[PDB]
């Protein structure tokens, strides 16, 4: 058996990933939503496949993250594959035109949120077998790619989390953790369906055997 | 031919040494900032002896202080030739699991948001200037592609985040002929603050291309 944990599972790639794991035999899935009672798709998913466990998480709300270890501990003794998926993407374009609020929100939600989530869930991951850790990042997060676009707070936040992911990989290598930053695709770079992003992500999540990688969905490396 | 320099965090360290180096140059006006100017003893004495050195208050962690910096600089000058975001903190190193919430937050507000907001407030003054030079004092520890065998935690993450946004800014302001750089001032193989300041002032004067990540000697660093 393997416990997978996915934040932001109510819709998007996160829902598509949970949908797909719900298929795989002997897979337990802790799936989070900000508002589980409005998570119509995902409550139905869990009712048909009750190995899918639904759980409250707002990654922008420290009081929500302060409860995530108990909330997950209701359903499991461990986590094999942690996925920080929940995230926002609200501000793009020039720096002179990006207000304080946008920088602050992208930091708390996209950088602090995941770091606090991993910190809270590290004890549970440490007791698991696979010790796999996936921050859903973005290719716009690279300090060494040029898309001919500005990503403002969005890009900054993905780069900030990339930096810390890189360090965390170094830091946990001794404990045989597999730590990766992963660009899931776009759902101009070719867009893919959420179910396509999910399928490639599930494959990467099972295939990846080395730490400190920055991966695109298809398994090819990106520059940091 | 007169040039105005803006230096955040001028009360001590590299900042003090840069203002001290600039104070020696003819036709260079220096707007030097301190969180608490009344206790900025060395800086106030420099300003007492060299009237081309103007001391203004700035806390870059504080929106209310940032909201005032443009009007306050404007009393002492109509333009900025060279903008130097030097003020910053370095209080968080070591492993992610030992780094509490408040170190991430403080390094974000002081080292990312502050420099960003400070540039936004002071851009009009810089546009009106001749040199249009914009330096963010960063760190080689912020590179995504250097390995020092050290964990830089919130310090390192904040310099990476400022580096990403600096590089974007260099693209955005290329059409207005701004020069934007992120600059590692050295470790103060260690050097002295005065050595760092000598090298940085050479660099500020010579850099004629935007979007570079540089060390104090003018050699390039990878982002
Ligand atoms: N897909 C793309 O085009 C690209 C996206 N990415 C990454 O892929 C992921 C995108 O996921 P996807 O579901 O497809 O995106 P969506 O924009 O469709 O939704 C984001 C998800 O995160 C949740 N969420 C947002 N804010 C919070 C919060 N503060 N607390 C908790 N949950 C929150 C949303 O829940 P709610 O219903 O409450 O809003 C939702 O489940 C992110 O990690 C993103 O960084 C990176 C590269 C490109
Ligand atoms: N080894 C090194 O020297 C390295 C340093 N750097 C960078 O060099 C720069 C300066 O370093 P150094 O001179 O040695 O630093 P010091 O610690 O000696 O001095 C830091 C300066 O920043 C000011 N500052 C701190 N917080 C604030 C704030 N909230 N508002 C306004 N000013 C503030 C300090 O003011 P106060 O006295 O009031 O606290 C002081 O003037 C920084 O940008 C730092 O990131 C990066 C790479 C390596
Ligand atoms: O330019 C972009 C980048 C993204 C986007 C949508 C939200 O996710 C990507 O960050 O528009
Ligand atoms: O998105 C955000 C922004 C903040 C937050 C919580 C702590 O206060 C921050 O402004 O979540
Ligand atoms: O150093 C900081 C930290 C904060 C701040 C302003 C807004 O609240 C943050 O805690 O400056």
CB atoms within 10 A of CB A223: 13
At residue A223, the 3 state secondary structure works out as: coil
Cβ–Cβ under 8 Å, residues A19 and A45: yes
Q: CB-based contacts of B84: which residues, under 8 Å, 6+ apart?
A: B5, B6, B7, B8, B18, B135, B137, B204
Cβ–Cβ under 8 Å, residues B81 and B4: yes
The owner of tokens 């104070």 is B23
Asked if residue A137 belongs to a known ligand binding site, the reply is: yes
| Nearest of A219, A127, A112, A165 to residue B151 by alpha carbon | A165
Q: CB-based contacts of B81: which residues, under 8 Å, 6+ apart?
A: B3, B4, B5, B129, B130, B131, B132, B133
Breaks (C-N over 2.5 A) in chain B follow: 188
Searching chain A, which residue's CA lies closest to the CA of residue B160?
A: A160
Residue B55 backbone phi and psi in degrees, to 5: -105, 125
Q: Is the CB of A157 under 6 A from ligand 3?
A: no
Span from the CA of B108 to the centroid of ligand 5 (angstroms): 8
- What pairs with residue B32 in β-bridges? B7, B55
Asked if residue B188 belongs to a known ligand binding site, the reply is: yes
Q: How far is CA B103 from CA A25, A200, B91, B158, in A?
A: 42, 36, 8, 10
> How far is residue B20's CA from residue B23's CA, in Å, rounded to a whole number?
5
Q: Solved how?
A: X-ray
A49 is in which domain, residue-wise?
Answer: 1-224
Q: CB-based contacts of A169: which residues, under 8 Å, 6+ apart?
A: A177, A179, A180, A211, A212
Q: How many residues does chain B have?
A: 223
Q: Spell out the alpha helix ranges (H) of chain A.
A: 12-23, 40-48, 62-65, 68-73, 100-106, 113-127, 152-172, 194-207
Long-range contacts of the stretch A195-201 (C-beta < 8 A, 24+): A195/A16, A195/A19, A195/A20, A197/A13, A197/A16, A198/A13, A198/A16, A198/A17, A198/A19, A198/A20, A199/A20, A201/A13, A201/A17, A201/A134, A201/A136
Token pair for B124:
């009009």
Q: Do A115 and B104 touch (CB under 8 A)?
A: yes
Give which of B164, B211, B222, B223 to mutate to test A binding, by max A Cβ within 10 Å. B164
- What pairs with residue B181 in β-bridges? B135, B212
> How far is residue A89's CA from residue B194's CA, in Å, rounded to a whole number?
43
Q: CA B95, A109, A170: angle at the middle one, nearest 5?
A: 25
| Nearest of A84, A88, A140 to residue A114 by alpha carbon | A84
- Residues from chain B that touch A116, judged by Cβ atoms under 8 A, are 101
| Nearest of B72, B69, B91, B83 to residue B30 by alpha carbon | B83
Q: Do A162 and B160 touch (CB under 8 A)?
A: yes
The owner of tokens 């403002």 is A152
Question: How many structural domains compose chain B?
Answer: 1
- Distance from the Cα of residue A220 to its chain's centroid: 18
Looking from the CA of residue A149, the nearest atom of ligand 3 is: 1
> How far is residue B2's CA from residue B4's CA, in Å, rounded to a whole number?
7
Residue B117 backbone phi and psi in degrees, to 5: -65, -40
Q: CB-based contacts of A43: which residues, under 8 Å, 6+ apart?
A: A36, A54
Q: Is the CB of B115 under 6 A from ligand 2?
A: no
Q: Would you list the DSSP string of B93-149?
A: -S-GGG--HHHHHHHHIIIIIHHHHHHHHHHHHHHTSSS-EEEEE--GGG-SS---S
């Amino acid at each position: 058996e393997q416990t997978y944990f996915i934040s932001g599972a109510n819709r998007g790639i996160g829902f598509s990933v949970v949908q797909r794991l719900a298929a795989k035999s002997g897979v337990k899935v802790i799936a989070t939503a900000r508002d589980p009672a409005s998570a119509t798709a995902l409550n139905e998913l869990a009712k048909e496949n009750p190995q899918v466990k639904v759980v409250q998480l707002d990654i922008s709300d420290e009081e929500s993250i302060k409860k995530i270890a108990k909330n997950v501990s209701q359903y499991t003794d461990s986590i094999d594959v942690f996925v920080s998926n929940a995230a926002i993407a609200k501000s793009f374009g020039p720096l002179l035109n990006t207000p304080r609020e946008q920088w602050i929100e992208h930091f708390f939600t996209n950088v602090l949120g995941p770091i606090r989530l991993f910190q809270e869930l590290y004890p549970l991951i440490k007791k698991g077998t696979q010790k796999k850790v996936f921050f859903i990042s973005s290719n716009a997060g690279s300090l060494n790619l040029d898309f001919g676009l500005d990503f403002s707070a969005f890009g900054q936040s993905k780069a900030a989390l990339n930096y810390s992911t890189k360090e965390l990989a170094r830091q946990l290598k001794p404990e045989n953790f597999i730590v990766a930053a992963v660009h899931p695709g776009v759902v101009p770079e070719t867009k893919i369906t959420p179910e396509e992003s999910a399928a490639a992500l599930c494959k990467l999540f099972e295939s990846l055997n080395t730490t400190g990688k920055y991966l695109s969905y298809d398994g090819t490396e990106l520059p940091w």
